[PDB]
Structures are given as C-alpha cells and as structure tokens.
Amino acid sequence: TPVTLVNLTPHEVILHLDGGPLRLPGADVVPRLLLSEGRQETLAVYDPERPGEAAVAREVPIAVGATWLGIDPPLPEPRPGTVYVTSRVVAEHFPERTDLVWPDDLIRDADGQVVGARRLGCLP
Template sequence: MPLLNLTPHEVTVLSDDARVIGRYPAAARPVRVPVVRVRVGEVDGVPLVRQYHGRTVLPEERPGTWYIVSTLVAAAHPGRRDLLVPTDLVRSADGTVVGCRALDCHTGPELRRMVCEEPGAGEVTEP
C-alpha cells in the first residue's frame, strides 16, 4: 500500500529500538490549511484574535493509497478515511523531532474500526 507524504517535512518512522522502519520525503507542494485571523480585542497591548481554519484541497481518494498529513489537515477533513498523522514523536536531546513511532488513523471511532483494524484483529478501544 503506498504511503504519500503531503507534509512539508520528511517523515521518518522508527521502531521501539530506533531502527528506521520507513522514510517518506517531504512533499514538493505540501498541503496546508488556510487560516483567517480576525482581531477581537487586546489585553495589555497584546492582540487577541479568533482563528478560523478552512479546508484545503487534497488528492482524490484512491483505493490502497494513504496520505500522511498534519493533525490540522486531518481535522479539517473528518470524513476522509485515507489520512494518517505522525504520532508518538521521537525527539533528540535538544527537543527536535527526529521521527515518530506510528501513524494515527485520524478518524472517529466508527471509521477507525473500518480503516485501521484488520478483520479479526479485535476491538478498537478509545482512550
């Protein structure tokens, strides 16, 4: 199954013993969520804004293809069943993200059962 990275960063997936499981190059044209900020006031001279997120244009769903996206992109498209989000991030000593240990099937519980669970793999539980 192809995994295509639509983020502006290379995504490196690491095993528990820090072995590279997969490496997915950054997208030449990353998918980003448009943001509109409306100023609603200020406190101590600091602007307060209300932020609105729009939808972005994603590739069409293709059977057998998964897209790695940011949490914000996945949240903007809750009905998409083909979006994966890096999770369980691994950081260097200075706090820089160097990889992740898994990709989250960023969907609701019903879709998560259909998308992420192999037939007969058992129940999917929500935290």
C-alpha cells in the same frame, strides 16, 4: 492489500518500526493553511512590571474566532490503496476522510529534533 503511503507534509517522515526505519520523503510544495482573520478586538492588560497601575496598561489586539477555509494546495482525491500522511490538524478538519493519518509517538534527539515516529494516528 498493503497501502502506499503518500507524504503530504514538507518534511521527511521517519517511522521507527520493529523491522527497522522506514523513510517517507518530504513533498515538494509549501502547504498553506487558509485561515480567515477573525473579528479584531482589543484587550486592556496590566504591564507586569506595573501590576496595579491602569495608567500604563497596554491595549492588546485580540483576534476572536480565527477560522479555517481549507488548504492552499488542495488535498489529493482519494485513491484505492493510498493513505495520505498529513498533520493531525489537517486530518481533524477533514473528519469524513478515512485515508488521512499523521505521525505520532515522536522520538526527539538531544537537540529536541524529531528523528522518528513510532506509529501513525488517525481519527475514530
């Protein structure tokens, strides 16, 4: 009746729990999110050092509507009694999957590094 957590992130997940820490090793892969280059446009922007002067304004690339296509190593298929630890953004893109969670309520150290998650998160 308990589940096996499977870490699909490249980083060790440390869960800070009442019973003491629980470590999920990172996965031996480099996940790539498969984005699509949106419509490439331009935006004229004042130089902050020359706020009034349109003459020296810059033309700034603006990518309208960068879209998601999937993930480069695909998600494993569901397996009874398995829960997959991924990112929130990956979970948000597969709302139909109730077996996806992400680390949440993070603990950072003095150098700003995550050293623990106090809980998991999931969609409604």
